[PDB]
Amino acid sequence: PLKYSYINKCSRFLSDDRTEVPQLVNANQYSPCVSIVPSTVWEDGDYYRKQLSPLEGGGWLVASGSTVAMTEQLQMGFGITVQYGTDTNSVCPKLEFA
Amino acid sequence: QVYNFKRLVFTNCNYNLTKLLSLFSVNDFTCSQISPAAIASNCYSSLIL
Amino acid sequence: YVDVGPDSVKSACIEVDIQQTFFDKTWPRPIDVSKADGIIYPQGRTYSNITITYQGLFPYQGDHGDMYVYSAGHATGTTPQKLFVANYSQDVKQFANGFVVRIGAAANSTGTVIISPSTSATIRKIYPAFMLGSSVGNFSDGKMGRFFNHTLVLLPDGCGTLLRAFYCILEPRSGNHCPAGNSYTSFATYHTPATDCSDGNYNRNASLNSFKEYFNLRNCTFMYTYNITEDEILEWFGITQTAQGVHLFSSRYVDLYGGNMFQFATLPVYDTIKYYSIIPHSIRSIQSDRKAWAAFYVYKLQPLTFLLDFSVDGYIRRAIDCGFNDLSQLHCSYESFDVESGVYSVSSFEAKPSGSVVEQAEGVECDFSPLLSGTPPQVYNFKRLVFTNCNYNLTKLLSLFSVNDFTCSQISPAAIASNCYSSLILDYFSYPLSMKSDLSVSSAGPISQFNYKQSFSNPTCLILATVPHNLTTITKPLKYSYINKCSRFLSDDRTEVPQLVNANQYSPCVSIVPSTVWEDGDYYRKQLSPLEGGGWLVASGSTVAMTEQLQMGFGITVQYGTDTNSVCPKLEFANDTKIASQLGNCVEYSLYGVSGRGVFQNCTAVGVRQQRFVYDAYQNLVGYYSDDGNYYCLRACVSVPVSVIYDKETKTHATLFGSVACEHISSTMSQYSRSTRSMLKRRDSTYGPLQTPVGCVLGLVNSSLFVEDCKLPLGQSLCALPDTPS
């Protein structure tokens, strides 16, 4: 990546300009703020906003983010989850039945 | 980027995770509610990465 | 990306006319849960003829569904004309944990053409098309239901024997009657039986090509196809979504006659669906040959629980929606489809809440009364009032003057009055309207340069106004005045350094200038001490003639607390319902942060007075002393116990509300304990409630019979006879 980046805020402003509603990310779901945030964060501490649709009651989507310098070897991570079942268990380790 | 994740849902297929482990140096290995050895050997309806 | 093939050549579309009033029909079809209608088979397990219980997403028993009917488009003579469809494209729906549908139910029966219903054509199954996604919005003509980024497409192509799924970015088309066009009406798709669905050559791309005329497929990430065969038997189908992706279910693939649904397929897309819609469709057949199509229904899934009656062949044949009514709950409590006769307790009515009552301190008010008397200061001499922790109404304050300038920087002028803040600060001074061009935080004029400035770290406002003839305690300066120079001569007596006024501060030159400037162009100087580096203070000023009513200016700044915003526009029920008390029903309440729900009544006093909250030994609030000086008492609220009488031999029932009495009983309940009361209404739609010594009842009938043992006694001398034997 040009820089490593992340979102350090995601909340929506109330339409009356006095309060703001936090949006913690839901398990196994993209945060709603991804629709306005750029594919990388151009500068540390950048923030963005989008007006909410009338179906949402108005107010503004708000998000901000931060970056980390690029490194000599790529750093990465993984999340692993599994799903239990009975007659749906078609994924296994490679097997030998000899 | 951490808010842009790619997901791979695996169904109907066979695996050998140590082949993947040979491709990278792991600087943090941990599991949740399962031993790390068991998640490699357990069979499942899905595997998600 | 996916090789979908070439797009349609024309950007043009056949015009879509909305004919929705032709499609009005009333034909509800509630779920028969005892036939297992709409029930998805449990995952990965099967059972013998034993009854089990289960929880999962399933349609509600009382849901009659949403009905959709397709029809042929306009046609005349022997040829096609403009499309005629219902307004279904505008029916955006929130996705709500999946749905199931009923299709082909009216197949092998007859009806009418609908769009031209006088023709009375027989009706047959037709497969619907749908669009799903995470966002919706307006089409370039303001039409509803446009989808954004990538969306799902559920489209049959040609005959119902071929089905395709897509995940793609739709691109609007700029031709006439199409989504980027300014002649656009509504989205629709169509099929033409004269060239499509040929018996030796079904057109596998037919409906997709008509789809392509309104949207060019773009960057598709998924495509699927399926092989299906025709069948007049009713089918079930449905969709759910999980973190493993979307799942598809149908009864057709496995349980053709019982209607149990199984997961026919799954999809890789796990992107959350927030919206759902159905695509309009039309048949482009010859006018005399147009065919009517069978009714189609959609039902919504809910997290309900059920009894399930498995057969020994593992198909569920019957089920009980536990929450539908109290009888259904009893079946679930006994894990059976045949409960033994008896009288049984069932859950109580919750009663109902009434509009809220709140008491809190109120009387703060922001001290703004100094603005109303004496002579206001010259603009360089402005007076400041700082406010924290108090209540205000800036629009009331401003109605004491006529405002000839209402502007602000970094806040709208309306929002600064309504927003809560950690502080509110107001600066005030006399100021002629002749100088108004020079009053801005950005102005090039001498007022912003030397007399008054406001910080850009805080939201700010500037106001010009004049005094009404009824504010006689306000008095005016001999002339309006301002400083038009403020600099310090450098100690070498040739170099000079200007002193622009600091934001939110008096200019240093105010110390030499007199409280008003006596004449236009007056100037003053002060020698500076060696501690200042020497030099001379230099200043001058200018004036404007006094006017019939005083002209004034104001400055306002605010600080928003992160969590310290104590200054607010509280009003003591201005423009409100005045809810400080109710006498009463079951109102929710708050009393200085103490809260609960309950009934208040005007009772007598108990001591100790002014301790406010009276409590019992279990710490239940007993009552409260209001700030109107009256004690009120609190009984919280009460609920109505219910029981039912069940006659298993006749499979009939009746009910008792006990102690509540028939004065609070009505044909329907607004409180309420179960999703319906209609099971009682099956015979009690024709009868008033009856009072008995134990309590009010429904369907009991006053027979005045004397019987030794009813086998369903209600206690006391009461009894409840069964209907006589067949």
Decide: C237 and C103 in contact? Cβ < 8 Å.
yes
Cβ separation of B48 and A81 shorter than 8 Å? yes
Decide: C395 and C441 in contact? Cβ < 8 Å.
no
Q: Indicate which of C244, C263, C270 best probes the interface with B, i.e. most B CBs within 10 Å of its own CB.
A: C244
> Which amino acid is located at C710 in the chain?
C
Q: Specify whether the backbone of C643 is left (phi greater than 0), alpha (psi in -120 to 50) or beta.
A: beta
Q: Indicate which of A25, A39, A55 best probes the interface with C, i.e. most C CBs within 10 Å of its own CB.
A: A55
**From CA C459, how far away is CA A44, in angstroms rounded?**
25
- Rg for chain B, CA atoms, rounded: 12
Other CB atoms closer than 10 Å to residue C607's CB: what's the count?
A: 7
Name the residue among A78, A84, A89 with its Cβ closest to that of B49.
A78
- The H-or-E segment that residue C318 falls in is strand C316-321
Q: For strand C640-647 and strand C342-349, is the pairing parallel, antiparallel, or unpaired? A: antiparallel
Find, in chain C, the residue whose alpha carbon is nearest to that of B47: C244
**From CA C560, how far away is CA C567, in angstroms rounded?**
9
**Chain C residues in contact with B46 (beta carbon < 8 A):** 244
Name the residue among B3, B28, B44 with its Cβ closest to that of A84.
B44
Residue with token string 């309806």: B45
Cβ separation of A29 and C272 shorter than 8 Å? yes
Decide: C244 and C270 in contact? Cβ < 8 Å.
yes
For residue B9, list its beta bridge partners.
B48
Decide: C656 and C695 in contact? Cβ < 8 Å.
yes
Coil, helix or strand at residue C660? helix
Find, in chain C, the residue whose alpha carbon is nearest to that of B49: C244
Name the residue among A18, A83, A86 with its Cβ closest to that of C45.
A86
**Chain B residues in contact with A82 (beta carbon < 8 A):** 39, 42, 44, 46-48
Name the residue among B13, B39, B46 with its Cβ closest to that of A83.
B46
Residue with token string 């009888």: C327
Decide: C394 and C570 in contact? Cβ < 8 Å.
no
Min Cα distance B31 → chain A (Å) is 9
**From CA C461, how far away is CA C454, in angstroms rounded?**
9
Indicate the DSSP class of residue C501: P
Give chains near A: 3+ CB pairs under 8 A: B, C
End-to-end, the C-alpha distance of chain B in Å comes to: 15
**From CA A48, how far away is CA A65, in angstroms rounded?**
9
Find, in chain C, the residue whose alpha carbon is nearest to that of B7: C270
Name the residue among A16, A17, A83 with its Cβ closest to that of C244.
A83
* A37-53 burial: b if 16+ Cβ within 10 Å, else e: beeebeeeeeebeeeee
Q: Which residues contact A8 (CB under 8 A, 6 or more apart)?
A: A64, A65, A66
**Chain A residues in contact with C137 (beta carbon < 8 A):** 53
**From CA C146, how far away is CA C617, in angstroms rounded?**
62
Decide: C634 and C598 in contact? Cβ < 8 Å.
yes
With residues binned 3-state (H G I as helix, E B as strand, rest as coil), the percentages for chain A, rounded to 5, are 5, 35, 60
Name the residue among A34, A39, A93 with its Cβ closest to that of B40.
A93
**From CA C316, how far away is CA C351, in angstroms rounded?**
37
Tokens standing for residue C138:
């307006």
For residue C66, list its beta bridge partners.
C298
Min Cα distance C44 → chain B (Å) is 10
End-to-end, the C-alpha distance of chain A in Å comes to: 46
**From CA C661, how far away is CA C430, in angstroms rounded?**
73
Give chains near B: 3+ CB pairs under 8 A: A, C
**From CA C184, how far away is CA C180, in angstroms rounded?**
8
Elucidated via: cryo-EM
Cα dihedral C719→C337→C698→C710 (10° resolution): -10
Decide: C398 and C465 in contact? Cβ < 8 Å.
yes
**CB pairs below 8 Å between A and B: how many?**
81
Cβ separation of C244 and B48 shorter than 8 Å? yes
Decide: C246 and C270 in contact? Cβ < 8 Å.
yes
**Chain C residues in contact with B9 (beta carbon < 8 A):** 244-245, 268, 270
Tokens standing for residue C724:
């006589």
Q: Specify whether the backbone of C199 is left (phi greater than 0), alpha (psi in -120 to 50) or beta.
A: alpha
Cα dihedral C705→C706→C708→C713 (10° resolution): 50
For residue B15, list its beta bridge partners.
A93
Residue with token string 């050549």: C9
Coil, helix or strand at residue C89? helix
**Chain A residues in contact with C272 (beta carbon < 8 A):** 29-30
Find, in chain A, the residue whose alpha carbon is nearest to that of C274: A32
The tally of CA atoms less than 13 A away on the side-chain side of residue C252 is: 23
Find, in chain A, the residue whose alpha carbon is nearest to that of C562: A19
Cβ separation of A90 and B13 shorter than 8 Å? yes
Residue with token string 């990546």: A1
**CB pairs below 8 Å between B and C: how many?**
9
Among residues C414, C417, C431, C419, the alpha carbon closest in space to that of C368 is found at C417
Find, in chain C, the residue whose alpha carbon is nearest to that of A85: C44
* Residue C489 main-chain phi, psi, to 5 deg: -70, 135
Coil, helix or strand at residue C486? strand
**Chain B residues in contact with A83 (beta carbon < 8 A):** 44-48
Q: Indicate which of A75, A86, A92 best probes the interface with B, i.e. most B CBs within 10 Å of its own CB.
A: A92
**From CA C53, how far away is CA C122, in angstroms rounded?**
42
SS (H, E, C) C296-343: EEEEEEEEEEEEEEECCCCCEEEEEECCCCHHHHHHHHCCCCCCCCEE
Interface list for chain C against chain A, based on CB atoms closer than 8 Å: 43-45, 135-137, 243-244, 270-272, 415, 418-420, 565
